[PDB]
Design a binder for these strands. Structure first.
Ligand SMILES: Nc1ncnc2c1ncn2[C@@H]1O[C@H](COP(=O)(O)OP(=O)(O)NP(=O)(O)O)[C@@H](O)[C@H]1O
Ligand SMILES: Nc1ncnc2c1ncn2[C@@H]1O[C@H](COP(=O)(O)OP(=O)(O)NP(=O)(O)O)[C@@H](O)[C@H]1O
Ligand SMILES: [Mg+2]
Ligand SMILES: [Mg+2]
Lengths: 36, 351, 352, 36
DNA sequence: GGTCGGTCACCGACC
DNA sequence: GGTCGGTGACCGACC
């Protein structure tokens, strides 16, 4: 879906960040040890 | 959340009821004190173990029941899975029991929770909303139709977020990310590299939990989708007169009347009902998959004959949806407009 | 409070309106957004300075109006005397001008108050009640019909008792007693017994009036019995002896009986609450005649089915008898045509 | 008539023996109040 | 009749 | 315990 929180958030960052690669990386690692 | 079957015994106005739910529209007809609202609070009490009308659980038991026992069995589906909640509220023994089991493809019942407190926590996980969000969006009780509309911006955003986010994920993510900063502070080239990690998690924390950033952006992006459908519903219903937008600064939902600005509380009875109903059927459309039911208990009586029929016309064009849509009314003028009926008198289903 | 005349320009959803109120029942009838409740908040505004729907005065100015100014003239009778209130709210200049005048028998207007606050203060002294009491008893707003009935105990008694006593009188009375007592003790054979004996009589009288425990309590109880007596009567007629009503403040408020089974007001259905609320209202209306001589019920017969709407309307008609200004507001033509005298509003103006 | 002060006269007479003296003092006070 | 200022009375405090 | 201090309500005058 369009109104998917983190898919919304994957994009809110790209506008507001250049270092959005390692940041969305960090976010992904974190969500994974929440998945676990 | 998709209601499938509901069995009630001796709950409030009810004596015995047994209802299959299905996609489409159903009107629940009936006089005053017939048991229409009881059936609504029933679903509410099946899931969240809270009702609308009473503070205390044992109040919900039909006082005429000779064994002082109200029993509820609710079966629902979410996201492919299928769940069964059984409840007994025994008012004499003062005992309240409650279990939630999963119903698996092989027809057995895997248990997930027993007792009220953990059933509610389990229900609130499976659904991804809390009770307040439930009754403020797609499950609108008698006399509380315009609560979302006239709410302050703070409340509105909380409600919207919750519908479209897991608070279970966010609660843990925020906590986990706290742990990984107080573990880096704990430490005391390595001290530069751990200073610069504390600071990249912190930029992440900020964009994600500052009130105040993405929450404000996300609410915007949802209400943008929601109000696009409402504006169109309002164009149809009022012939281009009413426009709706959302502003945090201007106190909440903000209505344009032939271009003129007015706070949602400025509106009248019918206009409020009319602009809560199109905002509610908009939310339900944008929340399909997440929220799969849409219930209204008596909006439509504020409304004059023109507006009642107009509102009925648009609502009827939801019949197509894969949604369990249920409206409740004593008004026969409204009810006759729809095909599938369920009549309730004296606490039982009739005919 | 007997509304005599009311004229409005640009308040809320109204353009122009000039209305002389009569005795017995009028029905105000008209579509969603006609301006029905707008007139209703106009009366409340003209007297107390407050709407129902907006915390801010300048929001009541009709935004279509080219001068950005709302004008209100309300004229009413209380206790033989006649008054007129003129209010101008200018949304553009952020100005609120209010003034109160007694209209003497000859017809000259003697000024009494000339500011929003001095007017509100004099109005409460005259009418006998604060704004909350007004909107919970006999002037019932759209969507607020059942607010007295499900109200918590301490409010219910503050409200019904405020009708029948005077905050103004009692406040002065208590102070003067406070001074006379102070002077006597300041003034400290037979004369001493006289000076000291009247000191005690004063104090024994002070104890009986102002220890909340004493007469104040008792008064509220006598008042309630009177109101509930009537309410029980109406309920017998309307529900074939099914529903009784009583008051217990340790039980959280008004308590209904259903064939003998106790049940707090908030537990009743939408229809049953409106039917019992109205009963309570009619009762208070009867019991405070001469003190409040108007009775306005806007949007109070929506969640009422056909059998109860017919039952409620017939009962309400049995007030047409009384010397009062009684007004019901509806958008439902069905309900409104059970009565004779209709006032039709569309587009913020009176029609027909 | 349900009048606050009428009811007090009845309430005081019930439980107070010096009431006739007391109601009298009240009347004088009510008068000094009405004057102001 | 509104406003603004003066004074006196009363409770608080420290003497 | 009595005296000194400050603040709070009523009243008359002036706008
Ligand atoms: N400040 C305002 N300026 C102009 N119009 C307004 C203002 N506030 C509200 N309105 C509109 O004025 C119209 C009359 O309002 P209202 O008096 O509440 O209607 P009503 O007759 O009681 N209708 P209803 O309660 O639905 O049966 C409505 O369309 C309002 O949206
Ligand atoms: N604890 C209780 N035990 C038994 N009856 C109750 C209880 N609480 C409420 N009732 C009654 O149960 C009946 C059904 O109430 P309810 O379900 O809200 O009616 P409804 O169908 O919504 N009528 P209406 O709102 O007027 O259209 C009413 O007569 C209530 O007063
Ligand atoms: Mg109901
Ligand atoms: Mg209205």
């Amino acid at each position: 879906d369009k109104l998917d929180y983190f898919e919304l958030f994957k994009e809110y960052l790209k506008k507001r960040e250049e270092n959005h690669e390692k940041l969305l990386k960090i976010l992904d690692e974190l969500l994974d040890e929440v998945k676990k | 959340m998709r209601p499938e079957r509901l069995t009630v015994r001796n709950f409030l106005g009810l004596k015995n009821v047994d209802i299959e739910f299905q996609s489409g529209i159903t009107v629940v007809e009936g006089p005053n004190g017939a048991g229409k609202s009881s059936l609504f609070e029933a679903i509410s009490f099946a899931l969240f173990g809270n009702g609308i009308r009473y503070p205390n659980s044992y109040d919900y038991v039909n006082r005429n029941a000779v064994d002082g026992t109200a029993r509820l069995v609710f079966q629902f589906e979410r996201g492919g899975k299928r769940y069964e909640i059984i409840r007994e509220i025994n008012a004499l023994q003062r005992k309240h029991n409650a279990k939630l089991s999963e119903i698996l493809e092989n027809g057995k019942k895997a248990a997930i929770a027993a007792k009220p407190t953990s059933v509610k926590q389990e229900v609130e996980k499976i659904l991804g909303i809390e009770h307040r969000t439930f009754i403020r969006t797609v499950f609108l009780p008698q006399g509380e139709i315009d609560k979302l509309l006239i709410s302050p911006p703070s409340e509105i955003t909380e409600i919207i977020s919750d519908v479209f986010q897991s608070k279970e994920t966010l609660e843990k993510l925020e906590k986990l990310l706290k742990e990984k900063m107080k573990k880096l502070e704990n430490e005391i080239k390595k001290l530069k590299e751990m200073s610069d990690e504390y600071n990249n998690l912190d930029l992440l924390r900020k964009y994600l939990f500052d009130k105040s950033n993405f929450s404000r952006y996300f609410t915007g992006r949802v209400l943008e989708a929601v109000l696009k459908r409402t504006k169109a519903y309002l164009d149809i219903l009022t012939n281009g007169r009413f426009d709706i937008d959302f502003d945090d600064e201007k106190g909440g939902f903000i209505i344009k009347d032939w271009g003129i600005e007015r706070p949602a509380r400025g509106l009248s009875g019918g206009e409020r009902a009319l602009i809560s109903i199109s905002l509610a059927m908009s939310l339900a459309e944008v929340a399909s998959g997440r929220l799969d039911a849409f219930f209204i208990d008596e909006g439509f009586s504020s409304l004059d004959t023109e507006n009642k029929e107009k509102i009925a016309s648009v609502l009827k064009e939801l019949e197509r949806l894969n949604k369990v849509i249920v409206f409740i009314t004593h008004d026969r003028e409204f009810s006759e407009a729809f095909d599938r009926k369920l009549r309730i008198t004296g606490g039982v289903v009739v005919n």
